[PDB]
Amino acid sequence: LSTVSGSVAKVSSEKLAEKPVANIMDALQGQVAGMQVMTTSGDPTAVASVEIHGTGSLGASSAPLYIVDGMQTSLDVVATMNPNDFESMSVLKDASATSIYGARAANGVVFIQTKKGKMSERGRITFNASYGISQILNTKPLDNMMTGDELLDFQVKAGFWGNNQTVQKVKDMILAGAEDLYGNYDSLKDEYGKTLFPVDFNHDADWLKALFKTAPTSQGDISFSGGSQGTSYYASIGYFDQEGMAREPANFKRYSGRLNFESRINEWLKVGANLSGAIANRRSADYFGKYYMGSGTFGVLTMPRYYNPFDVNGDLADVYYMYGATRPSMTEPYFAKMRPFSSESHQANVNGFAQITPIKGLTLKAQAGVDITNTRTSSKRMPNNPYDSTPLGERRERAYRDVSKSFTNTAEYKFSIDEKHDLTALMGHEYIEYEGDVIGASSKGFESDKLMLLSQGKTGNSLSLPEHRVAEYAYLSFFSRFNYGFDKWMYIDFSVRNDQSSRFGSNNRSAWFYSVGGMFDIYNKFIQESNWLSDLRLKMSYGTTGNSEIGNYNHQALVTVNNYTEDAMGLSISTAGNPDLSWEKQSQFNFGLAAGAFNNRLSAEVDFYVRTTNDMLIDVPMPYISGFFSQYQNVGSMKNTGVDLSLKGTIYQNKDWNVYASANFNYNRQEITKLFFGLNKYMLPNTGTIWEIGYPNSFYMAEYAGIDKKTGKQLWYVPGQVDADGNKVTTSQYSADLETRIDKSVTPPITGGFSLGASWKGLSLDADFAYIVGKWMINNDRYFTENGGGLMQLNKDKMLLNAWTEDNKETDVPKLGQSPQFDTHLLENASFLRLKNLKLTYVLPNSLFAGQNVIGGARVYLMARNLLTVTKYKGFDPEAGGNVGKNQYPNSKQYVAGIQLSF
Amino acid sequence: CELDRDPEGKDFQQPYTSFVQTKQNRDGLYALLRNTENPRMHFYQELQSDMYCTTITDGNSLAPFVNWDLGILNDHGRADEDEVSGIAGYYFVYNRLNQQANAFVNNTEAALQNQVYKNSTEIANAKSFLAEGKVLQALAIWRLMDRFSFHESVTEVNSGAKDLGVILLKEYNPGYIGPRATKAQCYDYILSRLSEAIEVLPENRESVLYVSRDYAYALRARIYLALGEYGKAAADAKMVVDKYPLIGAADASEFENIYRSDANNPEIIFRGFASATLGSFTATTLNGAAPAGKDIKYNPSAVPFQWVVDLYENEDFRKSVYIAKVVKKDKGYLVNKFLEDKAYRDVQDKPNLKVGARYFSVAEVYLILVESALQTGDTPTAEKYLKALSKARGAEVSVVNMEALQAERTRELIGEGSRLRDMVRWSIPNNHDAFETQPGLEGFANTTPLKAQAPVGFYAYTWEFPQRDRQTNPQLIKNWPI
């Protein structure tokens, strides 16, 4: 798989099996040292974001290579694989281990191996089933917002409804002219006042119950595993279904299948296949991340509490009212009923290999595989809707297709040149290909919901133009790896590969990379027997790899169709191009020390790495006078220096108990060493960040001081100026020259986790914790709930009542008519410690299945995911982010109870 | 293996070798112009004047511009692959138009010099295309200089920026960073493009959808008026004022039927192609309109003040077309100029509120001619055109004394974004806090004070350079002191 002198961290099968999410990499948060998994949404179709040893490039991707059984796959394809089929997961975070993988294997390789059948006299049949519920994890930030009466009094006093206005006038003649709007609609005309109070000033509406819910989750699979003396098989069929916890519908559902087969034909041939397929339905909540009125967690925070979306029964209505509107506003279950959306995706991955040993020594292996996805999605806009802009409906149908091929042919010759000198030589070839297209058609003008085929629309100016998008790439690669081993204690590895991709120019596409690694077993040569120490290895590596993940056609200078009339066509300039685009080179030095202890009851690993990115691919911000947004270029450099250490233990007590533990840690220091246009710093506009030479990716904003107690203004520190003895100097006029680079990093430096595990006679308990330390985020929702300057129709925080006036002059929140800025008072400390899962399982004892020969085992477990969080972030979730916390879909909290019958 | 993968639906940038390649890139230049000079980009400099009051519907979109929020207006707008809007979007679209007109002009100049065209009619058409590209370079540079350079009656600036213009590129390269030109260099470049392009384009208009000599005269008169030179402005406006008749209507519905239709409006010098399927867009910011079955319902984010409504007499034809009494179903007025055009409709019965881009109309040539004739000391011409324009619009002016001129120019160009430039050119301060709102709309339109006072000579009448510049080249001098 990898080299002996490599830094490889293996994750077993008990960390992947019983997980209630479709995000498999979310199960690895706080499990590998140096690998930082962050998932920034609780959507059932969202996917994780992995960074091994810090971020590596400013413009290209930093994601690892994801490899299932030899073929490299995307993470949405691995989303459609049953994780009860996975045997192990090994993360090759080194330069001497990722030497035979070459697309973007500078970022690390995550290798997933599927189960094969352990052969015996009787095969094994297991049947897993599971059910659970999912909730929202933090309902604390809406315990500080105003009520209805306080909000109307605050709005009346703040002049929002006009000068000389009593709370009773705004309450009666202004807002309760919701009778005029509801009286124009036949379905709400005779329902207003009886069972429909859209404006309610006595009680307060619950918007968390209107916008979020408790969702179900279920899964189940049957799996057979067997094998004879030559062959072996593992088959599995399954089912997974997860509903989203918001009222805006999002779901993931899949029916999977897998057959792994492996056969020894005769004394020189061995063949095998890993066939897989699925039928999956996805749907994502595709309004989160932006600010609308009654949408998302922004809607549970900022909707005025005197607006009722319910009935008198307590059930959710079809519409609600907001003052000034010209039509009613649909709720979420009704907007999801008049805009349907179905997706159906068929997936098939077929791999296969043939392995030939003609003579003793060499082993010619050939491997080939194809991944095929055919997606077909449809959406509607249903006709005859009273609360719409038009009574006519629309329908749009799209058909996606992806096909990826790969071939890998190696030939390895392994021999022994003497008694105590081992050598191994490997050479190989690899060809990866991809092509994909989207075709799409639309139709508008339907009048009945049964006559809604796409060929039955209006046929005049209601016709439109189809959609079509094609993409493709290819990689060609050759490699060779040599190993040498001395007597048993000294190992050297050498490696040379050549990589070409289709994403670069015709005379810039090929590159040469190399790697040198070495391991020294100090225990088996120097101190061959000891009472407490049990193993001691020292490994050291230097390598060079490349990164090429930027996008397909980015070096050409192009021209597209921009039609003017309907007679002749027109041509506009698309891109600028870059004729000398090439690879991004990354060199990594690694030095590690692995040690064991008291008959391997304690073990530890310490690794130090330096990682250097030269000629990095930056999507550089071309200035606006060129007429292009950006351009991919080979300019800049970066460096990541760090240490990561791991340790496993066993602390157990008696004959029956078995108590163990583990821990991880990783500190990582980034540094930008060269930017693009001869610049020393570049401030990214409207992000709040900066790239400056010598420092990591930091934050960049003014420092909020407080308020002036005599005038009520907001005050900021003028940077780099101190007056007489006193304090620093402040100012009350906001300028852009007040912005200082803060010593607070965008990507979090400290990352880790730990674990506890205890057991007894059958009963077992497991607990995994994962922490991120050093994270900061700009809370964007506190721009909307904490200002008196603008957006006065929204619900505000309770502190704005105690505002500065000439009467009330010993406060600390500012005067009313002032807009807030994106300064240091919006940077929140988003570091967290999370209890990832808490599992309590009970293997049923072997005494019950004594005489019955059809059932051979049973196992029952309870499980709770995401049930503890230790934060200072006041924003529904610290993990959902990446420098700005927008209207976010928070992480779920699951309670799952399943069974397994091994009969 | 060949690993050459080339895009679909995309070709390579090559020098022009045919006549149909020149025609194709010219049609691409005009379709790029249609998405630059459309009324959606001139709403920001219209709301920033002293005529608008934000309602309670506003979600902080128009409220920086109306209430003068200089903490947002410094770094405002986006220009990326998601959205193009704001001050940064206004900067980006005119720099893109300037660069693409440069590429077209230099490529057709080199094709003319290499003798790749067959006949003599192809040479004549290629020279006409070259002049039509020179006009568009002039328009792009002038509209950037309009917003991002100081008028000469300014008091406090960033030190060194009172006699600066914008960054002037005269040939296509996207890899250029440099310092700002002066105002004299940019104005001689603009006027050289226009005077070189008038001498080539023919005397009569070929089509209403392409650049003519009438549009070059109209643009040169507009630039000369906004410069401060009234003799050349009157001399240029006199050559185009008598070729385009006004709308002859008898009541407000006939004026609405002839004004709103682009195909039958007899006083358009230049406009962009629009169909129901290609070239139409909705501009529903100033009126907030939304279709509902067969009628329209309005929810405006900003409504005009009472002194704006009181400019129009009750028998004016523009008091039911340009502003309409449709707020809260009958209670107040909004600016309803860019409502709709009934030709660009999916179904003829149901509105979709789609309009097209118009670049110049003759009712601004009249106002340029009256203002220049009044300032150069010529009284019969100013009456001869102000009585004609105001009588064709419905209610005639009695006396012509440059108060009637200010009132008529404010009445005629509403929504087009010419009031901020006028109140800079006329030394008019803001006085947004002193104005009263419409009395029928209380509860909906209320009193918000300015977040920054704007006297005569304030720096914030001209916009600040977007913050991708001032970051990618540090030899760019910014505008504002803060």
């Binding site: 709040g688 603008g790 927008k886 | 902080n60």
Partner: peptide, 13 residues
């Protein structure tokens, strides 16, 4: 759906 409330910071990283 609904009206969009402005003044967001554009997310990068």
């Amino acid at each position: 759906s609904g009206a969009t409330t402005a003044t967001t910071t554009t997310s990068n990283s």
